[PDB]
Task: structure prediction
Amino acid sequence: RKQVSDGVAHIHASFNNTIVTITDRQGNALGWATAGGSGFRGSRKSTPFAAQVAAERCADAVKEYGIKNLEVMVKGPGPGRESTIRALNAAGFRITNITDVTPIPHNGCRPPKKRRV
Amino acid sequence: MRHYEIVFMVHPDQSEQVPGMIERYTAAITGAEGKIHRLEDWGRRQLAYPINKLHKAHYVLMNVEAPQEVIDELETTFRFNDAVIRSMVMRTKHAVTEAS
Amino acid sequence: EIDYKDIATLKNYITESGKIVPSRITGTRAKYQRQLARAIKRARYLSLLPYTDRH
Amino acid sequence: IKVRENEPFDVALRRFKRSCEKAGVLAEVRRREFYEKPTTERKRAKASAVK
Amino acid sequence: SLSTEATAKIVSEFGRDANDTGSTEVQVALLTAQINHLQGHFAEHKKDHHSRRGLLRMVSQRRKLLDYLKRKDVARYTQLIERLGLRR
RNA sequence: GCUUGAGUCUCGUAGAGGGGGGUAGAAUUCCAGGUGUAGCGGUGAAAUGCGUAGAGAUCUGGAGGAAUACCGGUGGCGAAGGCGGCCCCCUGGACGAAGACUGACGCUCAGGUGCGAAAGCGUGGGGAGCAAACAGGAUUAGAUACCCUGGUAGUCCACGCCGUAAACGAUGUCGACUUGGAGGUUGUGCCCUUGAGGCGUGGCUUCCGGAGCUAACGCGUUAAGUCGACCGCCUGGGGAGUA
Result:
């Protein structure tokens, strides 16, 4: 179906969850997979293992497109992200670019207070 | 009558109106008996980042000594004129004449 | 350093992602680190240099 | 940031991420505007950097 | 502060000659010139509390010099404040 | 009278000093639209919350407000509070070089006057983020808290008020003298520069230490050493900085 043959893997690692979205070069999503949607709810959805099985599961569900090349775009910090791109070249993809696209303000908005734990 | 360095980008699609504008601007300087020291037309140069997207734009370096009033109306001329995007006028750093 | 239009020189004194390099790395006596940075910023306004590498 | 595919490579192993953004810069902008704790955190950081 | 041409003009008006630039009438007249010019600046702005501190240093210093010159030669005092239009 | 105190003039230097105006780039939120699909968010774990009315992710376009990454540094400037994108306009001070000029014009200062973070108050705007109050979820024996999800005043602008802070080097101001070392920052002179030169002379500042002082801790040419001038303040704890 529609046979795009090149895409972008936007991986959005945060501290609590990694969410991998495989799209095309136009930016239209072709299929996604989160670490929290792969079993292991909770303290286990923020691990490199959960991110890699999230990326394995996002490599599935884009078989209908015949993607061979993809760029990787990485957001946020997280226990994910590093393992995530590994799972992508464990799934036959030719990984072309690895950009880190974490949003950094140039002293913009005030961050929240928190955490007197 | 103090020194100024004017640069300004021009929309690429109005590049053919560039030297005319230059003349008018220079004419305005000579309206106040101020003199113009260098003047460079840097061609359509590639922008390091997009602006209204609009890549490659046309740069003009000026380096004029003038009284501040004609520089001020030159700034308002750069405000209203839709052709010119990003002017920048600067300091004295007394009169220069060289290339880069 | 004194000048901002020489973007070869300025491009040496900047990292691969558009950020100004500290004088702790490049030597550059503090007076010229200040002129340097201020010239880098005047150049980033003119789009001679980039603010970042994700524009 | 960006690293182009090499002609004969298995792992890109980009270090672009490490030299700048991940470790410090994003973990710093998770929490409060002070003006006060940074003046003392930098004061004791520059007072710890001593022989 | 003040223009070089302006300072030179006031030194030429109030001194014994040029190069007599530290006499008491001359200092008073230069302080006076700057006080009036900054009356024009502080009618606008009005919340430039830093520049005003410089201005009140000028006012106080002018006052000290007028007190000196009053208790040295009173004829120079009356000619001086007569010419500068101060004292109200 | 005189110049060694104080000040004026000439020429430069560095600077987030102040006030007004403009602009730029990242990011957050919101709105509209494309792709796409079952979760997202959150936590120690959870739940409230958002989500098949299509969220989150992702791309495009727009609006708006605030703050200005990197440079950035026991770096700088300011009397103190404090001041951080870039550009213009108005403006204050400091420091240095040689020379000229005035000629004690100086120092401190009760009352007085001015400036004075933040929160707060008044009038009129603005309102993206953050967030007292507040609400819900948890935690707990309880939880009027810490943690989570929302969230109003406020924070932002104009003008006026308030008049305080661990407003702190817990060290009043001004001046003089008294062994050193390593730095930082900003001037400048001289001398093969024949480096990543050498040798000096100022201004501000950081760390360590000698004599001396100190109850000790420590201060130590930026004194808490050795003196002088003037001011402010103290006199056991509480009651009480209260009536």
